[PDB]
Amino acid sequence: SNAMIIGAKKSKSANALLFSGPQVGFVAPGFLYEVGLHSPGFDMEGSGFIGYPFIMFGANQHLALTATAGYGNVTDIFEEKLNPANSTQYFYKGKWRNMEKRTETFIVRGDGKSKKIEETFFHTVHGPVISLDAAANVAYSKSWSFRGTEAKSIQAYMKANWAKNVKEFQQAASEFTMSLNWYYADKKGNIAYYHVGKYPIRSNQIDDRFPTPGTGEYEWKGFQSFAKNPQAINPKKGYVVNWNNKPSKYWRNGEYSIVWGKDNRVQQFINGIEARGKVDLKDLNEINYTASFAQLRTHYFKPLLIKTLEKYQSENKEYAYLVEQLRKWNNLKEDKNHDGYYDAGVAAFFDEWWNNTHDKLFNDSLGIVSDLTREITDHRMGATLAYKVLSGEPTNYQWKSAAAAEKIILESTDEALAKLHKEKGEEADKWRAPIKTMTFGAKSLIAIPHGYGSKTEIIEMNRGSENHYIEMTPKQPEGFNVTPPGQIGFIHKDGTLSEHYEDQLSLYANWKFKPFLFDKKDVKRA
Amino acid sequence: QKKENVTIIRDSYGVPHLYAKNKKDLYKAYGYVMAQDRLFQLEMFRRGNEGTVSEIFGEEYVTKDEQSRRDGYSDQEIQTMLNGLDRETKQLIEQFAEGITAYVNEAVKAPDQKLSKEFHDYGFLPRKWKATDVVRLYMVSMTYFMDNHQELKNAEILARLERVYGKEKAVKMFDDLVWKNDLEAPTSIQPDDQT
Ligand SMILES: [Ca+2]
Ligand SMILES: [Ca+2]
């Protein structure tokens, strides 16, 4: 998920701006639900996740808000020491303790005939048992810092909906117990950013990248004050951008640091904001378009590739050509002429170059753990370690010397070019790859079916599942948004689809939007 | 535009805009319009949290239902959560559930017109809702963004590296794979911006 908030000094109109882009996948019916809520002193328009009695992406009379996932450290795993004579007992604070046991019955549809299966589940003082290592007399239990406070988080979000100023919104933020980033913009020109959640006070004797021994010496000691959560009102830079990246330089997240490295996809939003002076909502939309189509490895890896090839272009004419094509490429995989092929043929070379390079960097050392490390070293948010190795920047382990790294870059180039020459030809326009498409399907990230989906294909975009663009003018929030696939999920018994089942797909695919409605006079004619 | 005590204006995209005299009425209407538009989705999201999807979609979802029940909460535990909220807030969540239930009751009485195709095809009926079920709808999606077992993956990475390469090399490699803090990682705010 991505977000931007723009303060008065960075906004062309001198009004604070907000951009939302939650990434919750693409399903029909959609993951989001758009609504307008109007009662005395409470006027709010926007969307929330399906089933939520509150808006997360939108604006009330006073403030606009959005959120992105925090990735903060709110789950710890405890390694329980099991009694070798009784695997339902674990050692805790000097004594064997008994696990709480629960039997659960599952009715399963077969064929039609229904069957009953039973399973037994265990809890310790730390939480549910998630994994057994019986060989080691260990069980693993899971502690959430928000355990039992999920309803308090709902209440906090409702209070954010009802809030009228920074003080009230910050109060709501301080009560939210799960790990999100919250973003705020108001009609007085203020912007604010909060990394919300209840973050536990951990033992300073343990390495928080690994499970914590569960014997009692290393327990959490409460939760830190909200005043220690990363947060800023009216930061000096004049804006905040985020694409699930790190809140602030010294904020840590334990086992999940793999998302917060030097190479990070938020660079697309930083680049776009820093390349401009004062901005309007149209500028924000252009930044979203760039991020949505960017080949994210280009930011740091395309210059490294060019630098290597340039050293050898006097001997290798194919390298001179590649350099020219790479330099003129705008780093996007886009289809501006809607012909079904990505516009830059060299992007197909670059994709294959990267895949070859990643494998040559790590297969010889991490191949034996690649079922777990490939998701780190080729992560969708960035490839920091690969960047450091190829650039010669300091690492703890000496993966490759600069000479070995350069040979990898060259071998990967030769292999990628040889395959393109064999299958498509020598001109880059022949390399253009067919676009990847996506549908709004039947199964969301909760991993169970919730409808019948849609078969309408649109180009894949690394983009929010909805977008709002809001300007907090003195009169009212104004702007535009899109909430695909459509508002209404109802399909009649006879197969008739609601006219609002997928009537926002074209807007979404074509970078068009519908007006943000706030004034009732506008609503009645919308 | 159509009127209980709440005026509902559906715009040209079908988005409902609710005009109420108080929050109790507003939140009931909010649940009602969401159920009108999304009842089968709401039902299945709830079943996801309760671990009852395999009642509808079969054995392919048994392990998913097991995980959901393993890590989830009983109705009583959720009710205790609701009882710890501000009185008014709990009441509004109850109103929201009453609105969903109002549509359920309408749909089961006129199923051929008001129950969506998936219920007819899968051969079951929607049940009525309580405020605890609203909390379940929050948990099924929000917890996904918070819950992970990366600590266990990390322990496995380190152990496998150590058994082939030895401890000193494995530690260096692991520190490059899952760092303590990359001081060059781009950040949303600067340290001097902190309140
Ligand atoms: Ca942790
Ligand atoms: Ca094209």
SS3 sequence, B83-99?
HCCCHHHHHHHHHHHHH
Q: Residue B120's domain spans which residues?
A: 1-148
Residues 6+ apart with CB under 8 A from A466: A20, A21, A22, A30, A32, A34, A47, A57, A481, A482, A483, A484
Q: Which residues in chain B have Cβ-Cβ distances shorter than 8 Å to A36?
A: 9, 15-18
Query: What burial class does residue A459 get, using C-beta atoms within 10 Å of its C-beta: 0-12 exposed, 13-18 middle, 19+ buried?
Result: middle
Distance set, CA B145 to CA A131, A411, B167 (Å): 20, 39, 33
Q: Which ligand is nearest to the CA of A340?
A: 2
Longest CA span, chain A: 76
Q: Which of A114, A155, A243 to mutate to test the interface with B (most CBs of B within 10 A)?
A: A155
- DSSP states of A217-269: TT----B--GGGS-EEES-TTSEEEESS-BSSTT---GGGGGGSSSS-TTHHH
**B144 and B190 both lie in a single domain:** no
Determine contact, residues B95/A158, Cβ cutoff 8 Å. no
DSSP A277: S
CA distance B181 to A516: 41
Q: Which residues in chain A have Cβ-Cβ distances shorter than 8 Å to B110?
A: none
CA distance A207 to A218: 11
End-to-end, the C-alpha distance of chain A in Å comes to: 29
CA distance A46 to A35: 6
Residue contact B118–A452, C-beta within 8 A: yes
**B106 and B74 both lie in a single domain:** yes
Determine contact, residues A53/B92, Cβ cutoff 8 Å. yes
Which position has the token pair 């606009």?
A64
* A65: amino acid identity, one letter: L
* Segment 32-51 of chain B within 8 Å of chain A by CB: 33-34, 36-42, 44-48, 51
Report whether the peptide linkage leading into residue A200 is cis, meaning its omega lies within 30 degrees of zero. Answer: no
Tell me, in angstroms, the distance from the centre of ligand 1 to residue A452's CA: 37
CA distance A410 to A423: 20
Q: Is A329 left (phi over 0), alpha (psi -120 to 50) or beta?
A: beta
Question: Which tokens in the block code for residue A409?
Answer: 């870059």
Q: Which ligand is nearest to the CA of A72?
A: 1
For residue A159, give how far its alpha carbon lies from the nearest alpha carbon of chain B (Å). 9
Tell me, in angstroms, the distance from the centre of ligand 2 to residue A293's CA: 13
Question: Which tokens in the block code for residue A398?
Answer: 């000496």
Centre a 10 Å sphere on the Cβ of residue A266 and count the other Cβ atoms it contains: 22
CA A111 to chain centre: 40
* Cβ density class A82-115: b for 16+ within 10 Å, e for less: beeeeebbbbbeeeebebeeeeeebebbeeeeee
Centre a 10 Å sphere on the Cβ of residue A475 and count the other Cβ atoms it contains: 9
Instruction: Say if B110 is an interface residue toward chain A (CB within 8 Å).
Output: no
CA angle B71, B75, B79 (to 5 degrees): 115
Give the CB-side neighbour count of residue A317, counting CA atoms within 13 A: 2
**B44 and B132 both lie in a single domain:** yes
Tell me, in angstroms, the distance from the centre of ligand 2 to residue A294's CA: 15
The protein residues having their C-beta less than 5 angstroms from ligand 2 (an ion) are: A 335, 337, 339, 341, 343
Which position has the token pair 């990475």?
B157
Residues 6+ apart with CB under 8 A from A311: none
Task: Give which of A508, A520, A468, A462 is closest to A185, Cα–Cα.
Answer: A468
DSSP A427: S
Question: Which tokens in the block code for residue A447?
Answer: 């991993």
Determine contact, residues B64/B58, Cβ cutoff 8 Å. no
**B153 and B132 both lie in a single domain:** no
**B89 and B24 both lie in a single domain:** yes
**B62 and B156 both lie in a single domain:** no
Centre a 10 Å sphere on the Cβ of residue A371 and count the other Cβ atoms it contains: 12
**B11 and B64 both lie in a single domain:** yes
Alpha helices in chain B (DSSP H): 23-50, 54-57, 62-71, 75-83, 87-109, 111-114, 117-122, 131-142, 150-165, 167-177
Report how many domains make up chain B: 2
**B23 and B52 both lie in a single domain:** yes
The CB-based long-range contact list for B132-135 (8 Å cut-off, 24+ gap) reads B132/B75, B132/B78, B132/B79, B132/B82, B133/B46, B133/B97, B133/B100, B134/A51, B134/A53, B134/A154, B134/B31, B134/B93, B134/B96, B134/B97, B134/B100, B135/A150, B135/A151, B135/A154, B135/B78, B135/B81, B135/B82, B135/B93
Distance set, CA A360 to CA A307, A413, A415 (Å): 19, 12, 12
Question: Which tokens in the block code for residue B140?
Answer: 């099924």
Method: X-ray
**B40 and B89 both lie in a single domain:** yes
Tell me, in angstroms, the distance from the centre of ligand 2 to residue A339's CA: 5
Output phi, psi for B187, to 5 deg: -125, 155
Any bridge partners for residue A19, and if so which? A4, A469
Q: What is the 3-state secondary structure (H, E, C) of B18-37?
A: EECCCHHHHHHHHHHHHHHH
Task: Give which of A57, A2, A64 is closest to A30, Cα–Cα.
Answer: A57
Q: Which ligand is nearest to the CA of A335?
A: 2
Q: Does A364 count as an annotated binding residue? A: no
CA angle A373, A377, A378 (to 5 degrees): 110
Question: Which tokens in the block code for residue A208?
Answer: 């928080």
* A99: amino acid identity, one letter: M
* A212: amino acid identity, one letter: T
CA distance A137 to A89: 10
Catalytic option among A1, A153, A292, A444 = A1
Report whether the peptide linkage leading into residue A235 is cis, meaning its omega lies within 30 degrees of zero. Answer: no
**B136 and B180 both lie in a single domain:** no
Task: Give which of B37, B1, B6, B36 is closest to A526, Cα–Cα.
Answer: B1
The β-bridge relationship of strands A467-472 and A100-109 is unpaired
| Active-site residue, A465 included | no
